[PDB]
Short mmCIF file of C-alpha atoms (C1' of nucleotides) and ligand atoms in Angstrom, two decimals:
data_model
loop_
_atom_site.label_atom_id
_atom_site.label_comp_id
_atom_site.label_asym_id
_atom_site.label_seq_id
_atom_site.Cartn_x
_atom_site.Cartn_y
_atom_site.Cartn_z
CA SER D 430 -19.19 79.09 30.24
CA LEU D 431 -16.33 81.42 29.30
CA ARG D 432 -18.02 81.56 25.95
CA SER D 433 -21.49 82.71 27.15
CA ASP D 434 -19.94 85.17 29.63
CA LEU D 435 -17.67 86.67 26.97
CA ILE D 436 -20.58 86.98 24.53
CA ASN D 437 -22.68 88.63 27.10
CA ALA D 438 -20.00 91.07 28.18
CA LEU D 439 -19.18 92.08 24.53
CA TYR D 440 -22.84 92.55 23.52
CA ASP D 441 -23.37 94.64 26.65
CA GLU D 442 -20.29 96.85 26.32
CA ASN D 443 -21.06 97.37 22.67
CA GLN D 444 -24.50 98.67 23.62
CA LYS D 445 -23.29 100.88 26.52
CA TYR D 446 -20.34 102.76 24.90
CA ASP D 447 -19.43 104.47 21.59
CA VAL D 448 -15.74 105.20 20.86
CA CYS D 449 -15.43 108.68 19.41
CA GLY D 450 -11.74 109.61 19.30
CA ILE D 451 -8.17 109.17 20.49
CA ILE D 452 -7.09 111.37 23.39
CA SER D 453 -3.75 112.86 24.23
CA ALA D 454 -2.49 112.99 27.86
CA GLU D 455 -2.77 116.77 27.62
CA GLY D 456 -6.45 116.29 26.85
CA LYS D 457 -6.84 117.03 23.09
CA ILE D 458 -9.20 114.63 21.29
CA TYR D 459 -8.84 113.76 17.61
CA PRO D 460 -11.85 112.25 15.77
CA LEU D 461 -11.93 108.93 14.02
CA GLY D 462 -11.79 108.31 10.27
CA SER D 463 -14.37 105.88 8.80
CA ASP D 464 -12.02 103.36 7.13
CA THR D 465 -12.03 99.70 8.34
CA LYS D 466 -8.24 99.98 9.12
CA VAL D 467 -9.19 102.64 11.73
CA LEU D 468 -12.28 100.82 12.95
CA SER D 469 -10.57 97.37 13.19
CA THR D 470 -7.84 98.94 15.35
CA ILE D 471 -10.43 100.67 17.55
CA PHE D 472 -12.57 97.52 17.93
CA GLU D 473 -9.54 95.45 18.82
CA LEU D 474 -8.57 98.00 21.48
CA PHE D 475 -12.10 98.29 22.83
CA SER D 476 -12.34 94.46 23.20
CA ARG D 477 -9.05 93.77 25.04
CA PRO D 478 -10.18 94.76 28.57
CA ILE D 479 -13.45 92.78 28.31
CA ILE D 480 -11.67 89.57 27.17
CA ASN D 481 -9.25 90.13 29.96
CA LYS D 482 -11.91 90.64 32.64
CA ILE D 483 -14.00 87.60 31.61
CA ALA D 484 -10.84 85.52 31.30
CA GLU D 485 -9.68 86.40 34.85
CA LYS D 486 -13.18 85.50 36.17
CA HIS D 487 -12.58 81.95 34.89
CA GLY D 488 -8.93 81.58 35.84
CA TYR D 489 -7.56 81.87 32.26
CA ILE D 490 -4.25 83.58 31.43
CA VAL D 491 -4.50 85.91 28.43
CA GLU D 492 -1.44 86.33 26.16
CA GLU D 493 -1.21 88.64 23.13
CA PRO D 494 1.37 88.17 20.31
CA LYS D 495 4.80 89.33 21.27
CA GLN D 496 5.87 89.63 17.65
CA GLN D 497 3.72 91.20 14.96
CA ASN D 498 2.34 89.04 12.08
CA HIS D 499 1.28 86.38 14.55
CA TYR D 500 -2.14 84.80 15.15
CA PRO D 501 -4.17 84.88 17.46
CA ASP D 502 -4.95 88.31 18.90
CA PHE D 503 -5.60 86.56 22.25
CA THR D 504 -4.52 83.12 23.49
CA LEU D 505 -6.35 82.05 26.67
CA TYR D 506 -5.39 79.00 28.73
CA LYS D 507 -5.54 77.72 32.30
CA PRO D 508 -1.97 77.19 33.61
CA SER D 509 -3.15 73.72 34.78
CA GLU D 510 -4.07 72.81 31.17
CA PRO D 511 -1.55 74.56 28.85
CA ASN D 512 -2.40 72.26 25.92
CA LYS D 513 -6.07 73.12 25.69
CA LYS D 514 -5.59 76.73 24.57
CA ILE D 515 -8.35 79.00 23.11
CA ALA D 516 -7.48 81.37 20.22
CA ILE D 517 -9.68 84.48 19.93
CA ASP D 518 -9.21 86.71 16.87
CA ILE D 519 -11.02 89.99 16.14
CA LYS D 520 -12.33 90.49 12.62
CA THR D 521 -14.20 93.53 11.19
CA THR D 522 -16.13 94.40 8.07
CA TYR D 523 -18.45 97.23 7.17
CA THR D 524 -21.89 97.52 5.67
CA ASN D 525 -23.43 100.42 3.81
CA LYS D 526 -26.89 99.81 5.21
CA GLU D 527 -27.87 97.54 8.04
CA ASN D 528 -28.98 94.01 7.14
CA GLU D 529 -26.97 93.70 3.87
CA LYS D 530 -24.91 90.45 3.36
CA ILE D 531 -21.40 90.66 4.88
CA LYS D 532 -18.21 88.56 4.69
CA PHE D 533 -14.95 88.44 6.53
CA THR D 534 -11.44 87.35 5.64
CA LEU D 535 -10.63 84.61 8.11
CA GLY D 536 -6.86 84.43 8.13
CA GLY D 537 -4.28 82.85 5.87
CA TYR D 538 -4.67 79.31 4.59
CA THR D 539 -0.95 78.64 4.03
CA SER D 540 0.52 79.54 7.45
CA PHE D 541 -0.34 77.78 10.84
CA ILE D 542 -3.10 75.58 9.44
CA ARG D 543 -0.53 74.01 7.03
CA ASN D 544 2.60 74.35 9.16
CA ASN D 545 1.95 73.94 12.83
CA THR D 546 4.30 76.75 14.02
CA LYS D 547 4.15 79.18 11.14
CA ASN D 548 2.96 82.67 12.28
CA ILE D 549 1.26 81.60 15.48
CA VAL D 550 2.04 82.28 19.08
CA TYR D 551 1.77 78.61 20.16
CA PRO D 552 1.90 75.50 17.93
CA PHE D 553 -1.44 75.01 16.21
CA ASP D 554 -2.03 71.68 17.82
CA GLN D 555 -2.10 73.23 21.32
CA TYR D 556 -5.37 75.00 20.47
CA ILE D 557 -8.68 73.32 20.96
CA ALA D 558 -10.89 76.25 19.80
CA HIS D 559 -10.49 79.19 17.43
CA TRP D 560 -13.10 81.83 18.08
CA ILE D 561 -13.82 84.82 15.92
CA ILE D 562 -15.21 87.99 17.51
CA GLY D 563 -16.70 89.65 14.42
CA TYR D 564 -17.61 93.35 14.35
CA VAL D 565 -19.92 94.74 11.61
CA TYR D 566 -20.31 98.57 11.46
CA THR D 567 -22.49 100.70 9.11
CA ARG D 568 -20.11 103.23 7.60
CA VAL D 569 -21.06 106.95 7.94
CA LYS D 570 -10.84 119.58 14.16
CA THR D 571 -9.57 118.65 17.61
CA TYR D 572 -12.03 118.74 20.53
CA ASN D 573 -11.78 119.11 24.30
CA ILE D 574 -13.03 116.77 27.07
CA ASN D 575 -15.91 119.22 27.56
CA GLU D 576 -17.08 118.32 24.04
CA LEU D 577 -17.22 114.43 24.06
CA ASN D 578 -20.87 114.28 23.08
CA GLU D 579 -20.37 116.72 20.25
CA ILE D 580 -17.77 114.71 18.23
CA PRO D 581 -19.26 112.94 15.20
CA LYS D 582 -18.85 109.15 15.47
CA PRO D 583 -17.79 107.55 12.13
CA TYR D 584 -20.26 104.59 12.07
CA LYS D 585 -24.08 104.35 12.44
CA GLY D 586 -24.47 100.93 14.03
CA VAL D 587 -22.08 98.25 15.29
CA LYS D 588 -23.04 94.56 15.76
CA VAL D 589 -20.73 91.94 17.28
CA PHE D 590 -20.86 88.10 17.39
CA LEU D 591 -18.61 85.36 18.70
CA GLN D 592 -18.48 82.15 16.68
CA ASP D 593 -16.08 79.29 15.86
CA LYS D 594 -13.88 79.95 12.85
CA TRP D 595 -14.67 76.62 11.19
CA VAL D 596 -18.42 77.31 11.56
CA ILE D 597 -18.45 80.58 9.58
CA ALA D 598 -15.71 79.57 7.09
CA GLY D 599 -16.66 79.49 3.47
CA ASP D 600 -15.21 77.64 0.52
CA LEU D 601 -13.89 80.63 -1.56
CA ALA D 602 -10.76 82.60 -0.68
CA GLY D 603 -11.26 86.01 0.93
CA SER D 604 -8.11 87.45 -0.77
CA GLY D 605 -5.85 86.62 -3.73
CA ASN D 606 -2.23 87.60 -3.18
CA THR D 607 -2.40 87.37 0.63
CA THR D 608 -4.24 83.93 0.50
CA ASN D 609 -6.97 84.33 3.13
CA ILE D 610 -9.88 82.03 3.95
CA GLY D 611 -13.19 83.78 2.95
CA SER D 612 -16.13 83.44 5.41
CA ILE D 613 -19.67 82.58 4.25
CA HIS D 614 -21.26 85.57 2.55
CA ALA D 615 -24.34 85.79 4.65
CA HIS D 616 -26.49 87.96 6.94
CA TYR D 617 -25.35 88.76 10.46
CA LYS D 618 -28.02 86.28 11.81
CA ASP D 619 -26.32 83.45 9.98
CA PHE D 620 -23.01 84.14 11.71
CA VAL D 621 -24.68 84.30 15.12
CA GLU D 622 -26.57 81.07 14.47
CA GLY D 623 -23.65 79.33 12.76
CA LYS D 624 -25.32 78.52 9.50
CA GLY D 625 -22.11 77.70 7.59
CA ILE D 626 -21.18 75.16 4.94
CA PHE D 627 -18.71 72.70 6.61
CA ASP D 628 -19.98 69.64 8.50
CA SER D 629 -17.11 69.43 10.94
CA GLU D 630 -13.88 71.25 11.80
CA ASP D 631 -12.00 68.35 10.17
CA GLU D 632 -13.73 68.97 6.89
CA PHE D 633 -12.97 72.71 7.12
CA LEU D 634 -9.30 71.94 7.80
CA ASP D 635 -8.93 69.35 5.00
CA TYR D 636 -10.65 71.70 2.47
CA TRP D 637 -8.36 74.73 3.23
CA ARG D 638 -5.20 72.57 3.63
CA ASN D 639 -5.65 71.24 0.09
CA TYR D 640 -7.09 74.39 -1.55
CA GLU D 641 -4.87 75.55 -4.44
CA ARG D 642 -3.74 79.21 -4.54
CA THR D 643 -5.02 79.97 -8.11
CA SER D 644 -8.02 79.02 -10.24
CA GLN D 645 -5.84 77.48 -12.99
CA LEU D 646 -4.55 75.10 -10.25
CA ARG D 647 -8.02 74.67 -8.72
CA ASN D 648 -9.74 73.94 -12.02
CA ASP D 649 -8.27 70.45 -11.85
CA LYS D 650 -9.04 69.78 -8.16
CA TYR D 651 -11.94 71.72 -6.51
CA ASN D 652 -13.21 75.23 -6.45
CA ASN D 653 -16.07 74.89 -3.92
CA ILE D 654 -17.47 72.48 -1.27
CA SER D 655 -19.47 70.32 -3.71
CA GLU D 656 -16.43 69.67 -5.97
CA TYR D 657 -14.40 69.00 -2.82
CA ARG D 658 -16.94 66.36 -1.65
CA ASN D 659 -16.95 64.79 -5.14
CA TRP D 660 -13.08 64.85 -5.09
CA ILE D 661 -13.22 63.09 -1.68
CA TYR D 662 -15.79 60.56 -2.95
CA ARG D 663 -13.52 59.46 -5.77
CA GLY D 664 -10.39 58.98 -3.69
CA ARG D 665 -8.81 62.50 -3.83
CA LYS D 666 -8.11 62.03 -7.48
CA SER V 1241 4.62 128.37 1.92
CA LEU V 1242 2.08 125.48 2.35
CA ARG V 1243 5.09 123.10 2.66
CA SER V 1244 7.08 125.10 5.30
CA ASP V 1245 3.89 125.85 7.23
CA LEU V 1246 2.89 122.16 7.27
CA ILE V 1247 6.38 121.00 8.36
CA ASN V 1248 6.34 123.63 11.13
CA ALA V 1249 2.87 122.63 12.23
CA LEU V 1250 3.89 118.93 12.32
CA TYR V 1251 7.03 119.44 14.36
CA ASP V 1252 5.15 121.80 16.71
CA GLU V 1253 2.16 119.51 17.13
CA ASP V 1254 1.17 112.43 22.95
CA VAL V 1255 -1.73 110.17 22.38
CA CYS V 1256 -2.42 107.67 25.08
CA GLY V 1257 -5.79 106.04 24.25
CA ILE V 1258 -9.19 105.97 22.56
CA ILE V 1259 -12.03 107.58 24.47
CA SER V 1260 -15.69 106.73 24.44
CA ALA V 1261 -18.41 109.46 24.43
CA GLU V 1262 -19.14 108.32 27.98
CA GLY V 1263 -15.55 109.17 29.02
CA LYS V 1264 -13.94 105.69 29.54
CA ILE V 1265 -10.46 105.54 27.94
CA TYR V 1266 -9.01 102.33 26.49
CA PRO V 1267 -5.19 102.20 26.21
CA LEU V 1268 -3.19 101.72 23.06
CA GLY V 1269 -1.77 98.53 21.70
CA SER V 1270 1.84 97.97 20.77
CA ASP V 1271 1.66 96.81 17.08
CA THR V 1272 2.60 99.28 14.28
CA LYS V 1273 -1.03 98.60 12.99
CA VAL V 1274 -2.30 100.55 15.97
CA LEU V 1275 0.26 103.29 15.74
CA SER V 1276 -0.07 103.85 11.94
CA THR V 1277 -3.80 104.45 12.56
CA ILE V 1278 -3.05 106.84 15.44
CA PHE V 1279 -0.43 108.94 13.51
CA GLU V 1280 -2.82 109.33 10.56
CA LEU V 1281 -5.63 110.42 12.84
CA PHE V 1282 -3.23 112.79 14.58
CA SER V 1283 -2.15 114.44 11.31
CA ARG V 1284 -5.64 115.03 9.73
CA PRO V 1285 -6.51 118.18 11.79
CA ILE V 1286 -2.98 119.61 11.27
CA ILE V 1287 -3.11 119.12 7.48
CA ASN V 1288 -6.61 120.48 7.27
CA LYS V 1289 -5.75 123.55 9.34
CA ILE V 1290 -2.73 124.48 7.19
CA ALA V 1291 -4.46 123.73 3.97
CA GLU V 1292 -7.35 125.97 4.79
CA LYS V 1293 -4.92 128.74 5.66
CA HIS V 1294 -3.50 128.56 2.08
CA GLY V 1295 -6.73 128.19 0.15
CA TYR V 1296 -6.46 124.46 -0.57
CA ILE V 1297 -9.41 122.05 -0.42
CA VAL V 1298 -8.43 118.73 1.27
CA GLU V 1299 -9.93 115.42 0.02
CA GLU V 1300 -9.64 111.96 1.58
CA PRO V 1301 -10.35 108.73 -0.48
CA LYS V 1302 -13.86 107.31 -0.62
CA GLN V 1303 -12.64 103.81 -1.64
CA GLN V 1304 -10.50 102.16 1.00
CA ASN V 1305 -7.53 101.00 -1.11
CA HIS V 1306 -6.87 104.31 -2.91
CA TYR V 1307 -3.87 106.63 -2.72
CA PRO V 1308 -3.30 109.30 -1.39
CA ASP V 1309 -4.47 109.80 2.19
CA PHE V 1310 -4.83 113.55 1.40
CA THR V 1311 -5.25 115.29 -1.91
CA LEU V 1312 -4.81 119.11 -1.61
CA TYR V 1313 -5.74 121.60 -4.33
CA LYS V 1314 -6.80 125.15 -5.15
CA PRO V 1315 -10.09 125.02 -7.08
CA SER V 1316 -8.48 127.54 -9.46
CA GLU V 1317 -5.54 125.16 -10.27
CA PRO V 1318 -6.93 121.60 -10.47
CA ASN V 1319 -3.94 119.93 -12.18
CA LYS V 1320 -1.53 121.22 -9.56
CA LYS V 1321 -2.80 118.78 -6.92
CA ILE V 1322 -0.65 117.66 -4.00
CA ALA V 1323 -0.57 114.13 -2.60
CA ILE V 1324 0.34 113.61 1.05
CA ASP V 1325 0.52 110.07 2.43
CA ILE V 1326 1.43 109.05 5.96
CA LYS V 1327 3.93 106.25 6.48
CA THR V 1328 5.07 104.80 9.78
CA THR V 1329 7.83 102.47 11.08
CA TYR V 1330 9.53 101.83 14.40
CA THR V 1331 12.99 101.71 15.92
CA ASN V 1332 13.79 99.64 19.01
CA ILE V 1333 14.97 102.76 9.41
CA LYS V 1334 13.11 102.19 6.17
CA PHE V 1335 9.59 102.81 4.99
CA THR V 1336 7.37 101.13 2.47
CA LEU V 1337 6.32 103.79 0.01
CA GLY V 1338 3.39 102.42 -1.91
CA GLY V 1339 2.83 100.00 -4.71
CA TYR V 1340 4.94 100.12 -7.83
CA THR V 1341 2.33 98.45 -10.04
CA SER V 1342 -0.74 100.65 -9.46
CA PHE V 1343 -0.95 104.47 -10.37
CA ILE V 1344 2.73 104.86 -11.23
CA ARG V 1345 2.23 102.28 -14.01
CA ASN V 1346 -1.44 102.93 -14.64
CA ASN V 1347 -2.58 106.56 -14.46
CA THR V 1348 -6.03 105.94 -12.85
CA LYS V 1349 -5.40 102.74 -10.95
CA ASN V 1350 -6.09 103.00 -7.19
CA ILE V 1351 -5.67 106.69 -7.01
CA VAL V 1352 -8.24 109.34 -6.16
CA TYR V 1353 -7.49 111.59 -9.15
CA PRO V 1354 -5.49 110.65 -12.33
CA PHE V 1355 -1.75 110.56 -11.49
CA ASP V 1356 -1.08 113.27 -14.05
CA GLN V 1357 -3.08 115.76 -11.97
CA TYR V 1358 -0.58 115.66 -9.12
CA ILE V 1359 2.47 117.88 -9.14
CA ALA V 1360 3.99 116.66 -5.83
CA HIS V 1361 3.89 113.55 -3.71
CA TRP V 1362 4.93 114.23 -0.08
CA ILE V 1363 5.46 111.58 2.56
CA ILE V 1364 4.90 112.43 6.24
CA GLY V 1365 6.84 109.67 7.90
CA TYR V 1366 6.62 108.96 11.63
CA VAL V 1367 9.25 106.93 13.43
CA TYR V 1368 8.50 105.85 16.98
CA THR V 1369 10.73 103.98 19.37
CA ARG V 1370 9.12 100.86 20.80
CA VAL V 1371 8.96 100.62 24.59
CA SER V 1372 -2.49 97.77 29.88
CA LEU V 1373 -5.75 95.82 29.68
CA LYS V 1374 -7.62 98.07 32.10
CA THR V 1375 -9.81 101.05 31.20
CA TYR V 1376 -9.14 104.50 32.64
CA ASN V 1377 -11.23 107.47 33.47
CA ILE V 1378 -10.63 111.03 32.40
CA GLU V 1379 -6.29 109.16 35.08
CA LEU V 1380 -4.67 110.28 31.76
CA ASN V 1381 -1.34 110.76 33.43
CA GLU V 1382 -1.32 107.17 34.69
CA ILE V 1383 -1.81 105.58 31.26
CA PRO V 1384 1.24 103.84 29.78
CA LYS V 1385 2.05 105.09 26.20
CA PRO V 1386 3.15 102.19 23.84
CA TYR V 1387 6.06 104.21 22.46
CA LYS V 1388 8.98 105.99 23.98
CA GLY V 1389 9.42 108.85 21.49
CA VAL V 1390 8.23 109.85 17.98
CA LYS V 1391 10.02 111.80 15.18
CA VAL V 1392 8.23 113.08 12.03
CA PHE V 1393 9.51 114.49 8.72
CA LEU V 1394 7.90 115.69 5.53
CA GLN V 1395 9.84 114.92 2.33
CA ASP V 1396 9.16 114.33 -1.35
CA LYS V 1397 8.50 110.69 -2.17
CA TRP V 1398 11.16 110.57 -4.97
CA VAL V 1399 13.99 111.87 -2.78
CA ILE V 1400 13.67 109.12 -0.14
CA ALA V 1401 12.84 106.19 -2.48
CA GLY V 1402 15.32 103.39 -2.58
CA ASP V 1403 16.04 100.84 -5.23
CA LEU V 1404 14.98 97.58 -3.44
CA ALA V 1405 11.27 96.64 -3.11
CA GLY V 1406 9.77 97.23 0.38
CA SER V 1407 7.46 94.19 0.19
CA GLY V 1408 7.12 91.07 -1.99
CA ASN V 1409 3.58 89.90 -2.62
CA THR V 1410 2.20 93.44 -2.25
CA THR V 1411 4.86 94.98 -4.51
CA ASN V 1412 5.84 98.08 -2.60
CA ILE V 1413 8.62 100.58 -3.25
CA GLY V 1414 11.19 100.47 -0.41
CA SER V 1415 12.72 103.73 0.85
CA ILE V 1416 16.41 104.34 1.47
CA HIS V 1417 17.56 102.45 4.55
CA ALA V 1418 18.96 105.47 6.37
CA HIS V 1419 19.15 107.50 9.60
CA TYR V 1420 16.29 109.86 10.42
CA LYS V 1421 18.54 112.81 9.53
CA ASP V 1422 19.08 111.61 5.93
CA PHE V 1423 15.32 111.51 5.34
CA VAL V 1424 14.92 115.02 6.74
CA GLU V 1425 17.79 116.22 4.56
CA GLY V 1426 16.73 114.22 1.56
CA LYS V 1427 19.92 112.22 0.95
CA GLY V 1428 18.46 109.82 -1.56
CA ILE V 1429 19.82 107.81 -4.42
CA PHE V 1430 17.95 108.92 -7.57
CA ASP V 1431 19.17 111.88 -9.71
CA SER V 1432 15.70 113.14 -10.48
CA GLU V 1433 12.02 112.24 -10.10
CA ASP V 1434 12.15 111.17 -13.73
CA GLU V 1435 14.77 108.55 -12.95
CA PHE V 1436 12.85 107.38 -9.76
CA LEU V 1437 9.76 106.81 -11.82
CA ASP V 1438 11.42 105.14 -14.78
CA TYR V 1439 13.28 102.72 -12.35
CA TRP V 1440 9.97 101.75 -10.60
CA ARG V 1441 7.89 101.64 -13.77
CA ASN V 1442 10.26 99.00 -15.20
CA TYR V 1443 11.23 97.12 -12.04
CA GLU V 1444 10.40 93.38 -12.35
CA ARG V 1445 8.39 91.62 -9.62
CA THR V 1446 10.66 88.66 -8.87
CA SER V 1447 14.41 88.09 -8.71
CA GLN V 1448 14.21 85.71 -11.70
CA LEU V 1449 12.96 88.36 -13.97
CA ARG V 1450 15.12 91.01 -12.32
CA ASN V 1451 18.32 89.09 -12.76
CA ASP V 1452 18.14 89.63 -16.57
CA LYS V 1453 17.15 93.32 -16.25
CA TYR V 1454 18.26 95.13 -13.01
CA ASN V 1455 18.28 94.71 -9.30
CA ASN V 1456 19.63 98.05 -7.96
CA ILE V 1457 20.46 101.54 -9.24
CA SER V 1458 23.91 100.73 -10.73
CA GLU V 1459 22.37 97.90 -12.77
CA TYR V 1460 19.47 100.07 -13.98
CA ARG V 1461 21.96 102.70 -15.14
CA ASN V 1462 23.87 99.99 -17.05
CA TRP V 1463 20.54 98.77 -18.52
CA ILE V 1464 19.92 102.35 -19.80
CA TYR V 1465 23.39 102.34 -21.48
CA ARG V 1466 22.48 99.04 -23.09
CA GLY V 1467 19.42 100.49 -24.79
CA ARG V 1468 16.81 99.22 -22.25
CA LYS V 1469 17.38 95.66 -23.29
"C1'" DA I 694 17.45 89.89 0.40
"C1'" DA I 695 13.72 88.40 -1.36
"C1'" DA I 696 9.47 86.22 -0.44
"C1'" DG I 697 5.33 85.83 1.96
"C1'" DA I 698 2.75 86.62 6.47
"C1'" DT I 699 -0.72 89.98 9.24
"C1'" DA I 700 -6.07 92.32 7.85
"C1'" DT I 701 -9.61 93.92 4.53
"C1'" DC I 702 -11.19 95.92 0.35
"C1'" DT I 703 -12.50 96.66 -4.76
"C1'" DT I 704 -14.09 95.31 -9.18
"C1'" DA H 237 -15.13 85.33 -8.78
"C1'" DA H 238 -10.52 85.80 -8.92
"C1'" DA H 239 -6.87 88.69 -8.62
"C1'" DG H 240 -4.48 92.36 -7.00
"C1'" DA H 241 -4.46 96.96 -4.34
"C1'" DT H 242 -4.10 99.42 0.64
"C1'" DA H 243 0.35 99.36 4.86
"C1'" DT H 244 4.34 97.22 7.18
"C1'" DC H 245 6.85 93.61 9.22
"C1'" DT H 246 9.52 89.23 9.59
"C1'" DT H 247 12.95 85.85 8.30
CA1 CA B 6 -5.77 88.91 14.49
CA1 CA B 7 -1.92 105.90 2.48
#
DNA sequence: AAAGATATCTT
DNA sequence: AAAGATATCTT
């Protein structure tokens, strides 16, 4: 499948290469800082050619957002079937020590999942899968080409997984003012395996479509999956 | 001085990719998210070089949502610290200049050292003009750059601050909306840093609230006449 | 505009 | 946890 091939190619590339700096055309190399804003940019850039290669191998077109502030990082589709599009989005978080619990912010809950054309490259309904490539890294002068192995890398270990967004979605927000879905707070294994909390993608969608932006508003409705299932039991009242 | 040396070093000092230790190069994306990361990484060695030359220790933040990107100080003068923060935008200008509800209202909020320890707050602002999914080999000249040209300036934060917010839910100060030249020259709107700070320390978050207080510099000045009521 | 998206972190 | 910072762009 595209999905096993992509997984395999990402896992592989991640093991065979370590990014250590940005290079100028004149050949000066600048090292990397160890902030997730640097590492998410790097990981996104490192992934693009792999997605592209595996996509070509299966006849999919890859499109990236033309405008900024649009989901997804990559839309793949076969020209023959334009309405069965796949959304791939890259997410990153850090760990201080391998094997700690991690969590991701999984995108806004008030944009495309509530309004089919808000902040998304194609209408939401044209997508049949939303995959998350998640990167987890353990956080840890200019140089010349002759020094590539000498530059200190700003991370100790990097792990990557591909999983469906609904599968790893949690029931608490990942951010307040920017209203993001929070993922499960779990070990890396759990993301790989897909040990989430929702039973279907329909349940995930109904929960985040009806989630209220503040706890004073949520106090009356639901604040987690068990209160949501009770709320549903009783007739959404 | 440190400031003229840094400005000279920045003007004096073109990135086309990230490189792996194995020598494969991955090209650069087009979003400002990519380029803000690149211009910060580009400036760190410059800043550190100049700083060293003038006897200043440079410190980056440990926590990821703290200001500033670089704190510079002589260990002999620790309440004469300098804040340098890198800001980026594109042209096919205005900058967002940081929150107005964190350290300017609360001395230790989201800042590496207490706000009172800093004697200057410089902005290095990069402006790039907007214009591959293959990897390259150490082919550098064949790699497409995602930008057509880049300009940089160093200026004091108060001189280029505007009077309209630069963002809504993340409550940022907006700069003057001006030509590159005006930022270089420092053709701002506030009379002093004292006025810049009092305007932003009392700026209300929404238009509702603002409509009974002030929305721009003329209205703030009239609010001062009124007795800050 | 002014308001709210894009992504992730900190307490 | 919930809420609000970090940076910048879009409508
Ligand atoms: Ca994305
Ligand atoms: Ca900064």
